[PDB]
mmCIF file of C-alpha atoms and ligand atoms in Angstrom:
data_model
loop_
_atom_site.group_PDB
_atom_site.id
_atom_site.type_symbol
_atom_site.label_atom_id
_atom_site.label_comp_id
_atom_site.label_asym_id
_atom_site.label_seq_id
_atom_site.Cartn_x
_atom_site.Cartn_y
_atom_site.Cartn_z
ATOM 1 C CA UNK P 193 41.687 -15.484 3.370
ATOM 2 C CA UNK P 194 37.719 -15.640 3.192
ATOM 3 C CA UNK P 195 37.012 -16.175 -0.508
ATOM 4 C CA UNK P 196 37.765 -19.824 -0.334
ATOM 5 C CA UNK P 197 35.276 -21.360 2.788
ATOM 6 C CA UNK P 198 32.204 -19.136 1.048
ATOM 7 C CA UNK P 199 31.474 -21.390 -1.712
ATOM 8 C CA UNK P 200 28.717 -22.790 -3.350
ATOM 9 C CA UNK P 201 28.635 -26.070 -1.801
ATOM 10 C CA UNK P 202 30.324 -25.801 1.282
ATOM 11 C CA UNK P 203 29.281 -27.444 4.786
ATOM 12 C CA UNK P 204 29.278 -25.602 7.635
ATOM 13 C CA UNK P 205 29.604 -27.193 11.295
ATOM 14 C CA UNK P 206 28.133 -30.151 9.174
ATOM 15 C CA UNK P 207 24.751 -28.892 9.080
ATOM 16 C CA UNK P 208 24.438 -25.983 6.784
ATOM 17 C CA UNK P 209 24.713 -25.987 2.694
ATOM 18 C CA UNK P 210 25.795 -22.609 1.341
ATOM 19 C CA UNK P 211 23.750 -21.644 -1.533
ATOM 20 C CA UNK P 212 24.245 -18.245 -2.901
ATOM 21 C CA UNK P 213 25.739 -15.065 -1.363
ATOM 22 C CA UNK P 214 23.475 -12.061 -0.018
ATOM 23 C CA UNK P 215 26.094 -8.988 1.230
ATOM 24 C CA UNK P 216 29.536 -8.530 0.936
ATOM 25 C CA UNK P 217 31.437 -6.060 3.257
ATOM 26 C CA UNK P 218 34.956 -5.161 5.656
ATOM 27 C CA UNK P 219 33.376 -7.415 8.346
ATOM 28 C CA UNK P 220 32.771 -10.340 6.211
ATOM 29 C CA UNK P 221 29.921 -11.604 4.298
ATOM 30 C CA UNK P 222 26.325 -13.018 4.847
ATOM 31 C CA UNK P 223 25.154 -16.435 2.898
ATOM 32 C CA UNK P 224 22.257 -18.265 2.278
ATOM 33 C CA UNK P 225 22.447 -21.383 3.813
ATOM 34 C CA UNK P 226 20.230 -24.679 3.732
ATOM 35 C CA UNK P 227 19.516 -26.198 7.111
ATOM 36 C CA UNK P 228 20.295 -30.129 6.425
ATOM 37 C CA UNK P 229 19.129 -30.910 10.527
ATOM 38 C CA UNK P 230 15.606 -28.843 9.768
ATOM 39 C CA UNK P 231 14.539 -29.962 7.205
ATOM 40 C CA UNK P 232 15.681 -27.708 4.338
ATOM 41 C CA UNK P 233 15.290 -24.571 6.197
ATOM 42 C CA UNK P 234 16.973 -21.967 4.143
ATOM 43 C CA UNK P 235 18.882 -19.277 6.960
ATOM 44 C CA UNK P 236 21.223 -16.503 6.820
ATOM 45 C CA UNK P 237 24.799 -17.234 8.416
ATOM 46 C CA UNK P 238 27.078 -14.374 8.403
ATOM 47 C CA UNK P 239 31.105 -15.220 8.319
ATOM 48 C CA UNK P 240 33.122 -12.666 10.368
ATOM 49 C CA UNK P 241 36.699 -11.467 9.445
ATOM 50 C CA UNK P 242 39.061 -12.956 11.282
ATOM 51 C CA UNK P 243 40.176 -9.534 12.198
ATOM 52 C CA UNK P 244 40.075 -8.198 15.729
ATOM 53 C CA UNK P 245 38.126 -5.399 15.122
ATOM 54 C CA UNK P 246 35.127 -7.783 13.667
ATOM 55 C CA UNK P 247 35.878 -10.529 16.187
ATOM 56 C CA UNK P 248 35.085 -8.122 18.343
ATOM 57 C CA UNK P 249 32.037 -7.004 17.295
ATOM 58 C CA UNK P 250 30.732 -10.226 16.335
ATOM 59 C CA UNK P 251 31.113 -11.288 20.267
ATOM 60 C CA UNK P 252 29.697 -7.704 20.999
ATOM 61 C CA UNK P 253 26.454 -8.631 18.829
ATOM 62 C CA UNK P 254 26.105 -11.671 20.566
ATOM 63 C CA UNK P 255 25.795 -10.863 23.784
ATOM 64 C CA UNK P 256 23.216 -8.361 22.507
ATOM 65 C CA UNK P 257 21.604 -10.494 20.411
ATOM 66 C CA UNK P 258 21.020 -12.933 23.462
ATOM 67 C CA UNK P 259 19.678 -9.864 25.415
ATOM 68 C CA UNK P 260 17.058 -9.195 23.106
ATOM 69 C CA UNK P 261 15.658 -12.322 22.386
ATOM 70 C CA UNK P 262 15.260 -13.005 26.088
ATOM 71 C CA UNK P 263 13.741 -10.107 26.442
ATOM 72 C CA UNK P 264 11.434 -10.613 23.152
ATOM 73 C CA UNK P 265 11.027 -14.180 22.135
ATOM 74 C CA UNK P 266 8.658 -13.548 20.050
ATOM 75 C CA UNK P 267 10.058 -10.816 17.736
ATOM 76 C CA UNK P 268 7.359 -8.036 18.530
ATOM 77 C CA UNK P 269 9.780 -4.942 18.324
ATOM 78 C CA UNK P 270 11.057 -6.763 14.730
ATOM 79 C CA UNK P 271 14.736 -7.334 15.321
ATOM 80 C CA UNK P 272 16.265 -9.783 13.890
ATOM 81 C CA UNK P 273 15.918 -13.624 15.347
ATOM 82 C CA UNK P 274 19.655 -14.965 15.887
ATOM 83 C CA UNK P 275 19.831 -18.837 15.870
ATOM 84 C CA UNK P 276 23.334 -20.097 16.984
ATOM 85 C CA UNK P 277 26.975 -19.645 16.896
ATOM 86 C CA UNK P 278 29.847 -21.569 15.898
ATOM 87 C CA UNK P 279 33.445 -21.420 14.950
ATOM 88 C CA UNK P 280 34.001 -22.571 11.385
ATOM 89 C CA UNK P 281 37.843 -22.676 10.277
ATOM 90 C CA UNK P 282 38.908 -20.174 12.435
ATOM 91 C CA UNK P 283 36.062 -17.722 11.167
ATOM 92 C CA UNK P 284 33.317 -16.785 14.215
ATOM 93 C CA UNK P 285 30.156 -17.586 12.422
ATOM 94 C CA UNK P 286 26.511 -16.100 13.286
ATOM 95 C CA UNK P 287 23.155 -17.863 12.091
ATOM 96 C CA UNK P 288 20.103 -15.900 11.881
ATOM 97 C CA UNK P 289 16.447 -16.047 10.323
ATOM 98 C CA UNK P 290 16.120 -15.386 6.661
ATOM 99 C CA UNK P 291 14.832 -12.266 5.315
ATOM 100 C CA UNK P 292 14.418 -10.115 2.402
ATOM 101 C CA UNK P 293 16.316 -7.684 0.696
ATOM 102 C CA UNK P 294 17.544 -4.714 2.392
ATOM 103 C CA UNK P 295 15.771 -1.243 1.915
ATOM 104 C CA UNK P 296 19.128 -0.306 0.510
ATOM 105 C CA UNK P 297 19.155 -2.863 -2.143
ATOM 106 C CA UNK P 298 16.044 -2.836 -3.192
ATOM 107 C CA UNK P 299 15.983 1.176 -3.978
ATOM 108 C CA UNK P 300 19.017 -0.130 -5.736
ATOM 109 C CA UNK P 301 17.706 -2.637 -7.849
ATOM 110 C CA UNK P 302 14.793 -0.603 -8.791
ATOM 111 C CA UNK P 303 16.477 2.294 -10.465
ATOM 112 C CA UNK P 304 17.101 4.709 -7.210
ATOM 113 C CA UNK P 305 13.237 5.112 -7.014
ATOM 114 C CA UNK P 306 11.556 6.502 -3.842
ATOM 115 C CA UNK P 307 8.893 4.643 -2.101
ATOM 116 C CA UNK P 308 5.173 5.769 -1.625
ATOM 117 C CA UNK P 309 4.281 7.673 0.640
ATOM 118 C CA UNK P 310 2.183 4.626 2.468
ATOM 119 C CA UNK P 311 4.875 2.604 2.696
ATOM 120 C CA UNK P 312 6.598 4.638 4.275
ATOM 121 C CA UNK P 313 4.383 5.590 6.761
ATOM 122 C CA UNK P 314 4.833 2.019 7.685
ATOM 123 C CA UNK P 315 7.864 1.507 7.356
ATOM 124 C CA UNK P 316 9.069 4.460 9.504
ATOM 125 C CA UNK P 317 6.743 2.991 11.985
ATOM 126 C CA UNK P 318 8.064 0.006 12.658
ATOM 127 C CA UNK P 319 11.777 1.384 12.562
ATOM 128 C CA UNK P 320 10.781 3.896 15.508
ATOM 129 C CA UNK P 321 8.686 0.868 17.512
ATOM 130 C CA UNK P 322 11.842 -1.296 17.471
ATOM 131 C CA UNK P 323 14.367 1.074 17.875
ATOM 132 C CA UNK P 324 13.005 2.536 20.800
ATOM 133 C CA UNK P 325 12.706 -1.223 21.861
ATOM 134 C CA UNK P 326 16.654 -0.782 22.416
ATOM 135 C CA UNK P 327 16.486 2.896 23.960
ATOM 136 C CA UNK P 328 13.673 1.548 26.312
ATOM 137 C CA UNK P 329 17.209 -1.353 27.187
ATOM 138 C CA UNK P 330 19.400 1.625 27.714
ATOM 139 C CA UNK P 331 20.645 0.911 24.244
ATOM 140 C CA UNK P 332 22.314 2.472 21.503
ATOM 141 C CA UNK P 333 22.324 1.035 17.471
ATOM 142 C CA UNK P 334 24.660 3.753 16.294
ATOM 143 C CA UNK P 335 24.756 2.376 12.834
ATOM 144 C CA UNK P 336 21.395 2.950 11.427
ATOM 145 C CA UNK P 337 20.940 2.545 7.750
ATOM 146 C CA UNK P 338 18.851 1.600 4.764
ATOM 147 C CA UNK P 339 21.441 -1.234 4.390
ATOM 148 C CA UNK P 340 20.546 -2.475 7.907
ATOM 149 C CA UNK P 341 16.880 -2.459 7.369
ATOM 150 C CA UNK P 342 16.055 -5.725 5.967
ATOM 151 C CA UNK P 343 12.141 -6.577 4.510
ATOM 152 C CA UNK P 344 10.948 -9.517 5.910
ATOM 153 C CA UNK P 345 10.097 -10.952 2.672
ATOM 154 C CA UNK P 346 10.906 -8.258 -0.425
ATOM 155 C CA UNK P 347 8.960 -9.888 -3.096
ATOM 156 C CA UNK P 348 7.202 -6.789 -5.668
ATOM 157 C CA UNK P 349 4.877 -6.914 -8.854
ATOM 158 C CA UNK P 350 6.206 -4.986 -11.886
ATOM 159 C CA UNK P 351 3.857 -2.965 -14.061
ATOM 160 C CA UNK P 352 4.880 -0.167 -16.715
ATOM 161 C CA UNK P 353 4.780 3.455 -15.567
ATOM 162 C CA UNK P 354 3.847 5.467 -18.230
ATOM 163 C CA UNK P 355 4.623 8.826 -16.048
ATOM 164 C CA UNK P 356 8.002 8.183 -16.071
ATOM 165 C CA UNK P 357 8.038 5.942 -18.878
ATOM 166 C CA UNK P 358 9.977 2.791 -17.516
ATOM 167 C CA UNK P 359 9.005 -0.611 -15.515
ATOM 168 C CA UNK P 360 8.701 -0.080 -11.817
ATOM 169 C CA UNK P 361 8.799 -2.650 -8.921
ATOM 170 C CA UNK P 362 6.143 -2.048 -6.161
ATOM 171 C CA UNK P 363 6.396 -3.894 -3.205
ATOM 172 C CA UNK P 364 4.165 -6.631 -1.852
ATOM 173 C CA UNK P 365 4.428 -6.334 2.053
ATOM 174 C CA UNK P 366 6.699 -3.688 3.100
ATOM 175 C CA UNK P 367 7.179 -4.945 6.999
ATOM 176 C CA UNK P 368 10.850 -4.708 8.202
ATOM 177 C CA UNK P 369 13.427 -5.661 10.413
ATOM 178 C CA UNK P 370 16.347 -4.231 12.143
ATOM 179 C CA UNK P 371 20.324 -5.684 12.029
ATOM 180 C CA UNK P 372 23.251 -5.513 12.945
ATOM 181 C CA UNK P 373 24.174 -5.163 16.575
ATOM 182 C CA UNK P 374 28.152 -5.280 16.617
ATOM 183 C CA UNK P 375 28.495 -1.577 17.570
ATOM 184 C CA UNK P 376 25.879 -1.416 19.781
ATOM 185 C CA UNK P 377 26.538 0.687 23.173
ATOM 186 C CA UNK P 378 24.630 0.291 26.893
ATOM 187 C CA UNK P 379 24.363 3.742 28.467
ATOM 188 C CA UNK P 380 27.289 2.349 30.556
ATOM 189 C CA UNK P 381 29.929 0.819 28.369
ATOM 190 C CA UNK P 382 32.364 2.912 26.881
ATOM 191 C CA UNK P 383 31.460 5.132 23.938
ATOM 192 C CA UNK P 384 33.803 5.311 21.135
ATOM 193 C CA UNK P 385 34.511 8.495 19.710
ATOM 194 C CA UNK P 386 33.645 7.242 15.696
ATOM 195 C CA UNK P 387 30.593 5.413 15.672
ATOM 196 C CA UNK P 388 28.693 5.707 8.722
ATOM 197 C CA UNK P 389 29.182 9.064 7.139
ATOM 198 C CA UNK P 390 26.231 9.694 5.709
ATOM 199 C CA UNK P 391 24.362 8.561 8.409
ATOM 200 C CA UNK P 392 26.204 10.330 11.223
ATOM 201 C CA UNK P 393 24.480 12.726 13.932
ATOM 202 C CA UNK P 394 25.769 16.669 14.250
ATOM 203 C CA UNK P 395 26.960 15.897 17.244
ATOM 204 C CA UNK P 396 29.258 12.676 16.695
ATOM 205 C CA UNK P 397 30.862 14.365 13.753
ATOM 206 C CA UNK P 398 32.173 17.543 16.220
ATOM 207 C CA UNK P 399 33.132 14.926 19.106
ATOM 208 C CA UNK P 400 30.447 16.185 21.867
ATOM 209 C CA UNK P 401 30.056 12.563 23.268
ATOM 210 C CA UNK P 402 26.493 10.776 22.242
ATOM 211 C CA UNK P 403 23.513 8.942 23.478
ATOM 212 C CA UNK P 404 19.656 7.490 21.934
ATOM 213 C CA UNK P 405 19.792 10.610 20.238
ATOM 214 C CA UNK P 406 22.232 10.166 17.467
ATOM 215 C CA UNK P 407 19.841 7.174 16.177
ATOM 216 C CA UNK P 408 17.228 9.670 15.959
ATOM 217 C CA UNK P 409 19.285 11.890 13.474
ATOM 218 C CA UNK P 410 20.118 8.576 11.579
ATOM 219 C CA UNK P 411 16.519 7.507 10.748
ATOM 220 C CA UNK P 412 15.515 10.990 9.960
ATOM 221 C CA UNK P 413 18.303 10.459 7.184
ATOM 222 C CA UNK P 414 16.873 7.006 6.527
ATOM 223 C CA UNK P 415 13.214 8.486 5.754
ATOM 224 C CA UNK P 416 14.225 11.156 3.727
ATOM 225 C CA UNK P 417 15.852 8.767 1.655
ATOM 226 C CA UNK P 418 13.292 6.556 1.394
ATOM 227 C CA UNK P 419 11.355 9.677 -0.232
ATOM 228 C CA UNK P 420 13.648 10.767 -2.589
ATOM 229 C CA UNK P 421 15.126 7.620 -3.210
ATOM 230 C CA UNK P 422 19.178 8.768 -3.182
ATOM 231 C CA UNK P 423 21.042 9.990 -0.405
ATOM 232 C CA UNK P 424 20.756 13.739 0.646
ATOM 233 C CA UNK P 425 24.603 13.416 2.329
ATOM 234 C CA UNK P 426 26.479 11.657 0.250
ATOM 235 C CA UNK P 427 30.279 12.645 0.858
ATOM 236 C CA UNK P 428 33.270 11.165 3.001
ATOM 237 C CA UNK P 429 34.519 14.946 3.731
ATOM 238 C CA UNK P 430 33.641 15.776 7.285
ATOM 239 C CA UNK P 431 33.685 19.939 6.350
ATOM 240 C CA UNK P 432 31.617 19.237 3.323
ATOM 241 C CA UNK P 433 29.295 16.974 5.603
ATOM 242 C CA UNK P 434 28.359 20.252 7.637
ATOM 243 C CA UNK P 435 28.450 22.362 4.802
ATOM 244 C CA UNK P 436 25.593 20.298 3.012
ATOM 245 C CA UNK P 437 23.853 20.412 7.270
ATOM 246 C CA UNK P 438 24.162 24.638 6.980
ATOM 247 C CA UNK P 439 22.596 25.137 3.354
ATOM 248 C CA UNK P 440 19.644 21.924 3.840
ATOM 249 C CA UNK P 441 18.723 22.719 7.941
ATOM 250 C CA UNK P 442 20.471 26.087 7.965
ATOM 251 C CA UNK P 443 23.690 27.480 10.657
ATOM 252 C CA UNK P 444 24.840 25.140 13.542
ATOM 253 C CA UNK P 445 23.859 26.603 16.989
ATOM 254 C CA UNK P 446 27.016 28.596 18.449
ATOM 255 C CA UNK P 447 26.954 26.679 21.644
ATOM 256 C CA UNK P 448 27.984 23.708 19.946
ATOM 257 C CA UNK P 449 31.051 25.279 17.731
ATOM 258 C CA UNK P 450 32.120 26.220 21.032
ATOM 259 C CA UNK P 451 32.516 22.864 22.519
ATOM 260 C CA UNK P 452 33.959 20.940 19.896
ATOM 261 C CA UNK P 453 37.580 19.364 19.954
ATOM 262 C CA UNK P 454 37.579 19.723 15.937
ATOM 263 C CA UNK P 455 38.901 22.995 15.817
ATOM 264 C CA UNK P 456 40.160 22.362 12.071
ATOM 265 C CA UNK P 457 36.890 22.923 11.076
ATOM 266 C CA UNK P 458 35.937 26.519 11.966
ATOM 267 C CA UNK P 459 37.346 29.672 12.023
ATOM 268 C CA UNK P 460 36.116 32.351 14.772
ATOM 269 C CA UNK P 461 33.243 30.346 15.595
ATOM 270 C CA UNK P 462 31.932 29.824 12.261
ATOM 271 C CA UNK P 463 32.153 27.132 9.796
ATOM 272 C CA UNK P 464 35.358 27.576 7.794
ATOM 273 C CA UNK P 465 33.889 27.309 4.299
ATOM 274 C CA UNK P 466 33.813 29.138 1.337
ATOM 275 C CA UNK P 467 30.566 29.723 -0.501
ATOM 276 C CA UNK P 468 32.380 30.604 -3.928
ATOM 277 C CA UNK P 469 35.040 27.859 -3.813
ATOM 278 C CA UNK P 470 35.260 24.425 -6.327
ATOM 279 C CA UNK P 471 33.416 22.071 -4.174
ATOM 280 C CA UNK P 472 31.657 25.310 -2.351
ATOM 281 C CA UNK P 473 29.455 25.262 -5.626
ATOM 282 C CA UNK P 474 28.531 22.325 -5.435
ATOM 283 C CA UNK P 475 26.935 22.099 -2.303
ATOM 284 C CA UNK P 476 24.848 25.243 -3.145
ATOM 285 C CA UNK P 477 23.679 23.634 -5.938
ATOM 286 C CA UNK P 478 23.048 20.087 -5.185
ATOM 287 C CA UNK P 479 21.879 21.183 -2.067
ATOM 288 C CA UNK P 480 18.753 23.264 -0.931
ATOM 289 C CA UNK P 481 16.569 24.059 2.180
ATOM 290 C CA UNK P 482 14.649 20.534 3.283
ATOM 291 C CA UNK P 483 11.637 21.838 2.528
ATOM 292 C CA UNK P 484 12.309 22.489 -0.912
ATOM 293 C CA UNK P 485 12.765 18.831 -1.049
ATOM 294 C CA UNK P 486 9.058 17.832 -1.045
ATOM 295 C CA UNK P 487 7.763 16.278 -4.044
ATOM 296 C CA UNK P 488 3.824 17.566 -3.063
ATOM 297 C CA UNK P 489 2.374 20.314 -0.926
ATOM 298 C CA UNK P 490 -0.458 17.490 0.463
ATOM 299 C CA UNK P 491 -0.655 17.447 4.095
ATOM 300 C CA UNK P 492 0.527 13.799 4.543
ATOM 301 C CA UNK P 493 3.700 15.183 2.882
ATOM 302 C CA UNK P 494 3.465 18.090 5.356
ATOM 303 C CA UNK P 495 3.593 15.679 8.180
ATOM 304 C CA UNK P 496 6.544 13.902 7.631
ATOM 305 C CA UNK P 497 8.691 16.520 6.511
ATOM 306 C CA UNK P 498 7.224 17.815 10.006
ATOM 307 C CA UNK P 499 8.803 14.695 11.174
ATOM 308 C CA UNK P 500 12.225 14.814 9.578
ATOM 309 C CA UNK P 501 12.613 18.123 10.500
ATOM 310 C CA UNK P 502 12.379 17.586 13.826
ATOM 311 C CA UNK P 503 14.348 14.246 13.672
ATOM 312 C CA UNK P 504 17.092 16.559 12.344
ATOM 313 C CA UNK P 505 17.439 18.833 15.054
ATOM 314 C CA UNK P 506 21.189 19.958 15.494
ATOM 315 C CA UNK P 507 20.895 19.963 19.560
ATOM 316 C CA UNK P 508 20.707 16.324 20.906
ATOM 317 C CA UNK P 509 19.255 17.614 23.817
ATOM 318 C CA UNK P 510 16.431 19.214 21.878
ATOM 319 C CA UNK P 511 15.975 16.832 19.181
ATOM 320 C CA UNK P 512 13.190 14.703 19.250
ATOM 321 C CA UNK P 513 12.578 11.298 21.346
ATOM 322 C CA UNK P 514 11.358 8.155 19.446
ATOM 323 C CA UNK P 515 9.037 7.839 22.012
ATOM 324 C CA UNK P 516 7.564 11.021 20.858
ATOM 325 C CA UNK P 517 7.749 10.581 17.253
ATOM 326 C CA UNK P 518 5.515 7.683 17.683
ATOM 327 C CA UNK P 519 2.234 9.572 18.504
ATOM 328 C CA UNK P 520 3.395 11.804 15.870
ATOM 329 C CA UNK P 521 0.278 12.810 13.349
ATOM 330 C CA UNK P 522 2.053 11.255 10.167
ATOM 331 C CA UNK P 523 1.311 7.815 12.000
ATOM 332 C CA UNK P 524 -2.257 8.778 12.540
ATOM 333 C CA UNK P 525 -3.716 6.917 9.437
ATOM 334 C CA UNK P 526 -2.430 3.391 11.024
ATOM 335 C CA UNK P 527 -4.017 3.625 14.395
ATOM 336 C CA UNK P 528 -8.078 2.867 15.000
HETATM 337 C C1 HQB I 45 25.164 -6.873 8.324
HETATM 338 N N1 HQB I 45 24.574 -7.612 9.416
HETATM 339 C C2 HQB I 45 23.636 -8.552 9.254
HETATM 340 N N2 HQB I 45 23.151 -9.112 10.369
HETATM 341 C C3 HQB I 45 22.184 -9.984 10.202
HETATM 342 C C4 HQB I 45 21.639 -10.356 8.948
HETATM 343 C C5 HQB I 45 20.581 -11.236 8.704
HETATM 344 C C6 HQB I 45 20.080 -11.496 7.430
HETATM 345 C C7 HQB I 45 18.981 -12.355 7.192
HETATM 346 N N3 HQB I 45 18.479 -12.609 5.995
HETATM 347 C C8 HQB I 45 19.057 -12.014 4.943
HETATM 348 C C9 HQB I 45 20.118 -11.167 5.033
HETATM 349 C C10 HQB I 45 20.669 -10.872 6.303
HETATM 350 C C11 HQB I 45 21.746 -9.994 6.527
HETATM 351 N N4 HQB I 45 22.358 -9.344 5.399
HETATM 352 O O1 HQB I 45 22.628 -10.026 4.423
HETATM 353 O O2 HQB I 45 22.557 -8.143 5.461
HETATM 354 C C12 HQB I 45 22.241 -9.710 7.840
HETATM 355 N N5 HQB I 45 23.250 -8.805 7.995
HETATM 356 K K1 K I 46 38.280 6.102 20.937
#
């Protein structure tokens, strides 16, 4: 249905020139276009579905989108600049700035290889400063992930490492950006009950209902991957999910077993699992407490795992604020 108005070539609303493509997906995809009525402006212009469920939340992430760049015309709290909107044979059709490669992508392209530490000091930064932009707007991202932090430019210089014996790209300027907005929630709208796996809060997978807290889990999965460089939950299982939770953060809190509507998982209060099954193994083995996880014993390492761990707090009512995690010491070495 989509394959054949995403080509090469194409003209879009008689203005843009599709170059190359940047992100396939179930939404739709995002291409590089060039602006014919600026000049040659390259931009981004993503091609929704034409499925109701993307429809949807392409006319959710409008509305959204036009919120936030009232709000910010100038881009301080770094999310992403949308342009205009058009139909396009049928297809809704979103134009925004043009950025870099996502933080996904790029770990990706260079091997699964962490980031330094530095980097991400800055780079965790400036996710907290714009996503508590949205929780400031009584807003919700829900669907935080490397894939949806884009650099704003992602160009690197390649050298040979001769520690690990292989070439190794090292980024330029590391400053970021913040996407997509179609399942964004106000504190009023409805909340879904599903809102990606690896990415998902305690909470949201036992159905306890959710608020600015569940993005707080999500970038404390975000910045430990950006330090190991692979992702620490990386299943579709929901039982497995929270098995991998018990054996890296240790045993859920009892009051929330008690309250969940997922009663398939647990058995007399207590995570139906067993330690000395097939896939049981596995998790003991590929997993291990979070602090085992740290690749030094310096105190900058210290501090962030000081970070995650409290971004990873089971309790959404005791987890961390972003607010909070912004005076947080592991950002001390930016401030004056
Ligand atoms: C998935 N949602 C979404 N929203 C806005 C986007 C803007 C972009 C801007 N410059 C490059 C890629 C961009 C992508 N991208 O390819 O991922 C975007 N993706
Ligand atoms: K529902």
């Amino acid at each position: 249905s989509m394959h054949l108005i995403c080509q090469s070539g194409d003209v879009l609303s008689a203005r843009y020139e599709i170059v190359d493509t940047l992100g396939e997906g179930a939404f739709g995809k995002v291409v590089e276009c060039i602006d014919h009525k600026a000049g040659g402006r390259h931009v981004a212009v993503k091609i929704v579905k034409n499925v109701d469920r993307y429809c949807e939340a392409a006319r959710s992430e409008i509305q959204v989108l036009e919120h936030l760049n009232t709000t910010d015309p100038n881009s301080t709290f770094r999310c992403v600049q949308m342009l205009e909107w058009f139909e396009h044979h049928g297809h809704i059709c979103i134009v925004f700035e043009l950025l870099g490669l996502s933080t996904y992508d790029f770990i990706k392209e260079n091997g699964f290889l962490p980031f330094r530490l530095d980097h991400i000091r800055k780079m965790a930064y400036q996710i907290c400063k714009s996503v508590n932009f949205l929780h400031s707007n009584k807003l919700t991202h829900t669907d935080l992930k490397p894939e949806n932090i884009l650099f704003v430019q992602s160009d690197y210089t390649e050298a040979y490492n001769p520690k690990i014996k292989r070439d190794e790209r090292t980024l330029i300027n590391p400053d970021i950006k913040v996407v997509d907005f179609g399942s964004a929630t106000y504190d009023d709208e409805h909340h879904s009950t599903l809102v990606t796996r690896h990415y998902r809060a305690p909470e949201v997978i036992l159905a306890l209902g959710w608020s600015q807290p569940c993005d707080v889990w999500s970038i404390g999965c975000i910045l430990i991957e950006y330090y190991l460089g692979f992702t620490v939950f990386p299943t579709h299982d929901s039982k497995e999910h929270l098995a991998m939770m018990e054996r890296i953060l240790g045993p859920l809190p009892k009051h929330m077993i008690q309250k969940t509507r997922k009663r398939k998982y647990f058995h007399h209060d207590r995570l139906d699992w067993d330690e000395h099954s097939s896939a049981g193994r596995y998790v003991s083995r590929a997993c291990k407490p979070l602090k085992e996880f740290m690749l030094s014993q310096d105190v900058e390492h210290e501090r962030l795992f000081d970070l995650i761990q409290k971004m990873l707090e089971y309790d959404p009512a005791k987890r961390i604020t972003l607010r909070e995690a912004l005076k947080h010491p592991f950002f001390d070495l930016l401030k004056k």
